[PDB]
Design a protein around this ligand. Structure first.
Ligand SMILES: [Mg+2]
Ligand SMILES: [Mg+2]
Ligand SMILES: [Mg+2]
Ligand SMILES: [Mg+2]
Ligand SMILES: [Mg+2]
Ligand SMILES: [Mg+2]
Ligand SMILES: [Mg+2]
Ligand SMILES: [Mg+2]
Ligand SMILES: [Mg+2]
Ligand SMILES: [Mg+2]
Ligand SMILES: [Mg+2]
Ligand SMILES: [Mg+2]
Ligand SMILES: [Mg+2]
Ligand SMILES: [Mg+2]
Ligand SMILES: [Mg+2]
Ligand SMILES: [Mg+2]
Ligand SMILES: [Mg+2]
Ligand SMILES: [Mg+2]
Ligand SMILES: [Mg+2]
Ligand SMILES: [Mg+2]
Ligand SMILES: [Mg+2]
Ligand SMILES: [Mg+2]
Ligand SMILES: [Mg+2]
Ligand SMILES: [Mg+2]
Ligand SMILES: [Mg+2]
Ligand SMILES: [Mg+2]
Ligand SMILES: [Mg+2]
Ligand SMILES: [Mg+2]
Ligand SMILES: [Zn+2]
Lengths: 122, 118, 53, 50, 86, 203
RNA sequence: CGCGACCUCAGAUCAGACGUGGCGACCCGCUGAAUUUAAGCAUAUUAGUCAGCGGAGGAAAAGAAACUAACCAGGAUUCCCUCAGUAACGGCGAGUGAACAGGGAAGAGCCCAGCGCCGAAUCCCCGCCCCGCGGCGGGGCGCGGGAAAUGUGGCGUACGGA
RNA sequence: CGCCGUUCCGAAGGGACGGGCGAUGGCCUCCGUUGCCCUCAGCCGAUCGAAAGGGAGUCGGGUUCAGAUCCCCGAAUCCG
């Protein structure tokens, strides 16, 4: 009955919110136990329940972001958090298309005078 | 048409409300101070027991950021009781202690047994 | 009225062009067509306007 | 003083919690060298400076 | 009486904690930091104190974000991909 | 070919026509702020031969710089040294006023790139220059191959590193026997090369 | 009086972008001493150096001659060797002090304004369709909006060009 | 880097009883709300600056190992 992220992948949002609430109720009881003289087993359960709480929130956040990215896939403007991070300097670079652009004067020069392959006899 | 005042003032011009093409944040941030966050654990000292028995008061350690209204609403939802008032102090070690008094139709001594304090 | 600075500036610039001595090369442009000649000149020109986009 | 700012009352609280002896099970740790808390403070011998 | 006797009259603080660098050098009457220069936008720093620059340069702190960049640079700042699933 | 007539016209700065225009324009420029966004180039022909193009992303700024030399900013004129360094007046700044004008436009509009500048007027107190700047992120600039060079990070604040035409004139660059000071790209570069001891392994 | 153009100038939590701060070994632009040497010291030296301010990048800056030369000539920039502690500067004192040629490392060349000719042939942005979409782009369609004749694009730039 | 300056070279008001046009609503009756227009408008200086200055309104009794004009009991009061 341990919580594993794989088991949680396909579930609905409200189903995970319910599962989250049960763990949060459980942790609060354990925190009451921590000060009323609960056995070592209950104390050790705190860390197990805390990471179970993290796992559920992780799967909720991940699932929500996955669908937001699908939502904004075809959109021109996306939320700043859905745009590539990279580094600040790399985000300000000329993009792929802009770097490939050449003036018509340079395109004609390359067509008429392409660098050739040759050899010189020894 | 005419100016009855020698002063010239900037005329009022239309100011449109924002209509973003995209939201800067994809999703709202989750509430990190929900009810389970506000109430950390109950205090079980000798003076806390006196509060329960004599003053119909529960003693909780709560998040320092929480206010009285938040504590009152969290206590009611978590344990399904009614609260008369809340007194709060911040302890010398930084924790916030809440002196929660229950309505006269509630017995803090009974409620403590439900919570597990007693 | 105490007008904004930009209003005072363009009005005081119109007074300077009257107050100062304007060379004929600049002053030749104050002489212009009358409305009746400009209307005829503009109606004929209206018949040769460049084609729009 | 009694008159205190939240920021000062919070700085003082952290200085209060660091003023304790080390746990005694830290001694049995495998590669332990600490013998005691060498960062103990006394309100009278040395002052916090703020 | 400029010595021992005059040391008893000092009970008014000149500096307090600075909210930018955390050092007790925020002059209260001048509203300025003697250490970091707050509220000036730029950080106070001089080359006649090398020792002071190495006390609070980059690396002396947490490197919360800069040390993940050093990990991300070794893989070309790849984004939007994951290892092939089991 | 009007740009040819205008160029010749702006060479007769002591003619009655141009004296009148310079005088009233200097007056008008004097009633505005020391930094002022100009709707269009006052000198379209001079601007364009300095690189300006009449397309979106190019902007003009008029900068007013006080005329005169550099007074040493020492209290009460005391320099506390040897008589060789007692000068307070008659000292001159290493850079021109046009270069200072670009620097003041570049600092104000930090998101733009300063291209060049030119002279539009002066009186006893002020000199007036118009600075040509570029928005390096407008797509009329990024998508033009012939102006992509200035959108590079290596070209940030050209006016602040002596790279503009007006800025670079005070660096003593140039080819030939008059410019031995900057062999190596700069005065410091020449100095370091000429003042570094090369201690080869085998010496 | 009103209405309408343009010009100049404002206000917006208007749509979409961009700058700020840090680090600073190396790099560019400024500003810039005095200890010190001169057996004193003021020019000089220290030194365009320390300190101070600004701006960057993986390199920077420089760079395709308004050059060197005076030869039977070389041919952008940068670096190394040498030129050379030399020509020269200097209370001609103390001290300071390059370049050209020659040999190597590397090697790469180009683009505007202008003058002209092409029906502005040019550019940005919004809407819809296809593609691609974590470097937001390509194709198509809009009696869609704007910029731009106060000049965008193509040809063309001193080696000449049309 | 910045500094001077604090009303002095500034188009410095995002407000209001009332009225007029629409859009919506609800105890849809008739009243709200909202947008625009009309009308009216000095304050003339952002902001910071006192645990002794200005500044509404809490007193009695009991209670702890250590807190109380703060807890409990009783009786009041100001502001919205
Ligand atoms: Mg061309
Ligand atoms: Mg003491
Ligand atoms: Mg003081
Ligand atoms: Mg100099
Ligand atoms: Mg050159
Ligand atoms: Mg906006
Ligand atoms: Mg001496
Ligand atoms: Mg001696
Ligand atoms: Mg001496
Ligand atoms: Mg000297
Ligand atoms: Mg020198
Ligand atoms: Mg230095
Ligand atoms: Mg700096
Ligand atoms: Mg910077
Ligand atoms: Mg970098
Ligand atoms: Mg470069
Ligand atoms: Mg060469
Ligand atoms: Mg020799
Ligand atoms: Mg002599
Ligand atoms: Mg020297
Ligand atoms: Mg050579
Ligand atoms: Mg070779
Ligand atoms: Mg042309
Ligand atoms: Mg040539
Ligand atoms: Mg106040
Ligand atoms: Mg007070
Ligand atoms: Mg008082
Ligand atoms: Mg009461
Ligand atoms: Zn500080």
């Amino acid at each position: 009955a341990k919580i594993k992220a794989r088991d949680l992948r396909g579930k609905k949002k409200e189903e995970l919110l319910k599962q989250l609430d049960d763990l949060k109720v459980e942790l609060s009881q354990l925190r009451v136990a921590k000060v009323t003289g609960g056995a070592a087993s209950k104390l050790s359960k705190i860390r197990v329940v805390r990471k179970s709480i993290a796992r559920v929130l992780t799967v909720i956040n991940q699932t929500q972001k996955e669908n937001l990215r699908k939502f904004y896939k075809g959109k021109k403007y996306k939320p700043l958090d859905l745009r590539p991070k990279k580094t600040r300097a790399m985000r300000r670079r000329l993009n792929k298309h802009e770097e490939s652009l050449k003036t018509k004067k340079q395109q004609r020069k390359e067509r008429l005078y392409p660098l050739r392959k040759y050899a010189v006899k020894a | 048409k005419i100016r009855t005042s020698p002063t010239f003032r900037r005329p009022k011009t239309l100011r449109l409300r924002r209509q973003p093409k995209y939201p800067r944040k994809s999703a709202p941030r989750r509430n990190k101070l929900d009810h389970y966050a506000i109430i950390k654990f109950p205090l079980t000292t000798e003076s806390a027991m006196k509060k329960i028995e004599d003053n119909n008061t529960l003693v909780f350690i709560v998040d320092v950021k929480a206010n009285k209204h938040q504590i009152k609403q969290a206590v009611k939802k978590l344990y399904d009781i009614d609260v008369a008032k809340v007194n709060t102090l911040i302890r010398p070690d930084g924790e916030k202690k809440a002196y929660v008094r229950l309505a006269p139709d509630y017995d803090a001594l009974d409620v403590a047994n439900k919570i597990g304090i007693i | 009225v105490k007008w904004p600075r930009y209003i005072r500036l363009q009005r005081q610039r119109a007074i300077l062009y009257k107050r100062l001595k304007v060379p004929p090369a600049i002053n030749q442009f104050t002489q212009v067509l009358d409305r009746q000649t400009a209307t005829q000149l503009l109606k004929l020109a209206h018949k040769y306007r460049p084609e729009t986009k | 003083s009694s008159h205190k700012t939240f920021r000062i009352k919070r700085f003082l609280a952290k200085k209060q919690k660091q003023n304790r002896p080390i746990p005694q099970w830290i001694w049995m740790k495998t590669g332990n060298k600490i013998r005691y808390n060498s960062k103990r403070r006394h309100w009278r011998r040395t002052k916090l400076g703020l | 009486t400029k010595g021992t006797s005059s040391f008893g009259k000092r009970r008014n603080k000149t500096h307090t904690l600075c909210r930018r660098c955390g050092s007790k050098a925020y002059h209260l009457q001048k509203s300025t930091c003697g250490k970091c220069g707050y509220p000036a936008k730029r950080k106070r720093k001089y080359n006649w104190s090398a020792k002071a620059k190495r006390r609070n340069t980059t690396g002396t702190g947490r490197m919360r974000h800069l040390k993940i960049v050093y990990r991300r640079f070794r893989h070309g700042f790849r984004e939007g991909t994951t290892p092939k699933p089991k | 070919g009007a740009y040819k007539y205008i160029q010749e016209l702006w060479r007769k700065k002591q003619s009655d026509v141009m004296r009148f225009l310079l005088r009233v324009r200097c007056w008008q420029y004097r009633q505005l702020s020391a930094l002022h966004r100009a709707p269009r180039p006052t000198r379209p022909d001079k601007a364009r031969r300095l690189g300006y193009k009449a397309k979106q992303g190019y902007v003009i700024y008029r900068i007013r710089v006080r005329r005169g030399g550099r007074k040493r900013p020492v209290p009460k004129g005391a320099t506390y040294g040897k008589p060789v360094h007692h000068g307070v007046n008659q000292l001159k700044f290493a850079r021109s006023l046009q270069s200072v004008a670009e620097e003041r436009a570049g600092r104000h509009c930090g998101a733009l790139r300063v291209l060049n500048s030119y002279w539009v007027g002066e009186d006893s107190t002020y000199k007036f220059f118009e600075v040509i700047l570029i928005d390096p992120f407008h797509k009329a600039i990024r998508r033009n191959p012939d102006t992509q060079w200035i959108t590079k990070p290596v070209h940030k604040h050209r006016e602040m590193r002596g790279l503009t035409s007006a800025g670079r004139k005070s660096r003593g660059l140039g080819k030939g026997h008059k410019f031995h000071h900057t062999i190596g790209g700069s005065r410091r570069a020449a100095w370091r090369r000429r003042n570094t001891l090369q201690l080869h392994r085998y010496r």
